[PDB]
């Protein structure tokens, strides 16, 4: 339906970038027509694409052929799916399925979606909406164990923030951490980024939510990383740690913390910054003015609202 048309010579070069930005759509066969490649792509503003593509391109409606619960629901529910109330996107944390439904629906029909989600989906439990949750189908437990990138994480979805669709981010980070690195995880959560950074020789895992620190400790124990990860409960603001790599996993408010992170990091070090926006500019100015910094990599993590993304930038602070 929506394809990126490009001269096939930049075929692979480009194909990779779309992936790195979780843009490529895998539900369609990249077809070739003459000197061109049509890569099915998720919807995106023509503008932001310019910032991650150096070649010329076009966004077009192109017919293409195809290469699970999401189905049956969609068809048999367009009524509510086409007006908030219900979303065709759920998360899976451990063995726990978590739906996105609105209060505006009679439980007797709302619970039914769960009872019929505990069916077309491999789980032990089912809830819907860190906010408050409602038990719909399966077991009534909120504490589970997540598996991702080889490690395991203890998560109690009802007491601490955690995003399974962000594992890709931990994978990428996993490949960047050197043996000599000292990481300061400003917003650690149950500790997904801290464990993904094992190669580092020291890790400062900070988080103001006590439950995030209770489970984080259990995770540090579970992945055998006691002499590596130093857990710290507190407002990151009032912490005095130093390090050459700073991870800011708080997209919604990252910006209101940049000054602290710059005060923690060393010169020559990188700030893994996650934010929100339609472009990258506002997030770059912000740093570009605060420091003598340098972008080392910039990706689009995922979609937030409409054309509202969760960007990720990698900043090298060359001089405070």
Q: Which residues are annotated as a binding site for S-adenosyl-L-methionine?
A: 170, 207-208, 235-236, 249
- Cβ–Cβ under 8 Å, residues 265 and 271: yes
Q: How far is the CB of 200 from ligand ADN (least distance, A)?
A: 19
Q: Is 234 left (phi over 0), alpha (psi -120 to 50) or beta?
A: left
Q: Which strand ranges, in their side-by-side order, compose the sheet holding 2-7?
A: 31-33, 36-40, 2-7, 58-61
Structure tokens that stand for 104 in this block: 């505006």
What are the angstrom distances between the C-alpha of 281 and each of 48, 174, 275, 284? 10, 26, 11, 5
Pick the closer one to ligand ADN by CB: 113 or 160.
Answer: 160
The verdict on 259 binding ligand ADN (CB under 6 A) reads no
From the list Zn ion, ligand ADN, none, which binds 10 (C-beta under 5 to 8 Å, kind-based)?
Zn ion
- Work out which of 207, 217, 291, 299 binds ligand ADN, going by CB under 6 A: 207
- Closest listed residue to residue 287, CA positions, set 314, 250, 252: 314
- Work out which of 249, 293, 309, 313 binds ligand ADN, going by CB under 6 A: 249
The verdict on 206 binding ligand ADN (CB under 6 A) reads yes
Pick the closer one to Zn ion by CB: 191 or 243.
Answer: 191
What are the angstrom distances between the C-alpha of 66 and each of 31, 40, 90, 118, 250? 11, 10, 22, 27, 36
Pick the closer one to ligand ADN by CB: 216 or 225.
Answer: 216
Q: How far apart are CA 251 and CA 238, in angstroms?
A: 20
From the list ligand ADN, Zn ion, none, which binds 13 (C-beta under 5 to 8 Å, kind-based)?
Zn ion
Interacting span for ligand ADN (CB under 6 A) from 6-14, 90-98, 108-116, 207-215 = 207-215
The verdict on 161 binding ligand ADN (CB under 6 A) reads yes
> Distance from first CA to last CA of the chain, Å, rounded?
47
Interacting span for ligand ADN (CB under 6 A) from 61-69, 112-120, 137-145, 205-213 = 205-213
List of residues contacting ligand ADN (CB under 6 A): 160-161, 187, 189, 206-209, 212, 235-237, 249-250
């Amino acid at each position: 339906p929506l394809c990126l048309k490009i001269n096939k010579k930049h075929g692979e070069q480009t194909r990779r970038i779309l992936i790195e930005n979780n843009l490529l759509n895998k539900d369609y066969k990249i077809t070739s027509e003459g000197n061109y490649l049509y890569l099915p792509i998720k919807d995106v503003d023509e503008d932001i694409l310019k910032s991650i593509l150096n070649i010329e391109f076009e966004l077009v409606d192109k017919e293409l052929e195809e290469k699970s619960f999401r189905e049956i629901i969609s068809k048999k529910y367009r009524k509510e799916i086409d007006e908030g109330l219900i979303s065709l996107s759920y998360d899976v944390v451990g063995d726990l399925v978590i739906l996105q439904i609105s209060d505006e629906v009679d439980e007797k029909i709302r619970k039914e979606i769960g009872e019929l989600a505990y069916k077309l989906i491999p789980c032990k439990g089912v809830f819907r909406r860190v906010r408050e949750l409602e038990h719909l189908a399966g077991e009534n437990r909120t504490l589970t164990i997540h598996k991702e990138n080889g490690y395991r994480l203890w998560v109690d979805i009802a007491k601490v923030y955690f995003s399974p669709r962000l594992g890709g981010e931990r994978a990428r980070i996993m490949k960047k951490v050197s043996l000599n690195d000292v990481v300061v995880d400003m917003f650690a959560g149950v500790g997904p980024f801290s464990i993904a950074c094992k190669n580092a020789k020291k890790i400062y895992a900070i988080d103001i939510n006590p439950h995030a620190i209770e489970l984080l400790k259990k995770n540090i124990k579970l992945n055998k990383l006691e002499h590596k990860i130093i857990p710290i409960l507190s407002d990151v603001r009032e912490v005095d740690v130093k390090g050459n790599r700073v991870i800011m996993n708080l997209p919604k408010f990252a910006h209101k913390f940049i000054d602290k992170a710059l005060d923690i990091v060393e010169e020559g070090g990188v700030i893994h910054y996650y934010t929100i926006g339609k472009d990258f500019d506002k997030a770059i100015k912000l740093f570009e003015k605060k420091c003598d910094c340098e972008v080392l990599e910039k990706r689009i993590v995922k979609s937030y609202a409409p054309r509202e993304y969760i960007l990720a930038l990698d900043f090298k602070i060359n001089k405070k």
